[PDB]
Amino acid sequence: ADSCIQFTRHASDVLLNLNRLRSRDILTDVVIVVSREQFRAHKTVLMACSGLFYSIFTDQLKCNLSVINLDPEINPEGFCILLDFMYTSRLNLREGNIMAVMATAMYLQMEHVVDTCRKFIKASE
Amino acid sequence: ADSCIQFTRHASDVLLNLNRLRSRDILTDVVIVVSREQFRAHKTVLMACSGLFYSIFTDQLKCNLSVINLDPEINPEGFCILLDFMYTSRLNLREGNIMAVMATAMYLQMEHVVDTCRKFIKASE
């Protein structure tokens, strides 16, 4: 409706609270496996952030899986940095991790992260 | 980390996408029953927004329930307005619904909504 009021902080508060659920392992429903490193998460958060997880969890068979194995070329630290970004809006982009973060964001289909990586890399050359 | 960059729109985008999942009935895992009106939702979103649902879904028995029946004194339109607020940050507060919205927000333990209702009511008198 056009008569709505809006609580500016609501979306950020929701995200902070979803990250608290993740930290306390509350109602996490999938394990993402990256070269034997395991990450517990919520399928809905993964889907809301990534084109790859959205395609995975809308599949009629894959939606029922409790474990998803990522391509072995995917770097676990790169995945971890992206999983933290999904739950917090914060991206720990560093010189020593930028290539793995960009490669993982391209695989996960996270266009905004890909864009900032391309900008940081182009500025370095 | 202190070296993090932040994507300002991320939290709002996540919330918009969780509401798209709700609209398309994707991975909804609970039905909230309010005087025979039914509302499909995601337990994690309900918990991230409401002190009542956080207490419910952290309970070792209630966490497994796929249906939660609310007190019969709860108004379904009031609940619907609050469920939309949870997923969008927007509250459709109107003269004809403010009392039911405030009563439902007090029951759901949604303090920010209670606060704005108290302000709108005090301004009317």
Partner: peptide, 5 residues
């Protein structure tokens, strides 16, 4: 917070 969106 609350605003007119």
């Amino acid at each position: 917070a609350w605003v007119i969106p």
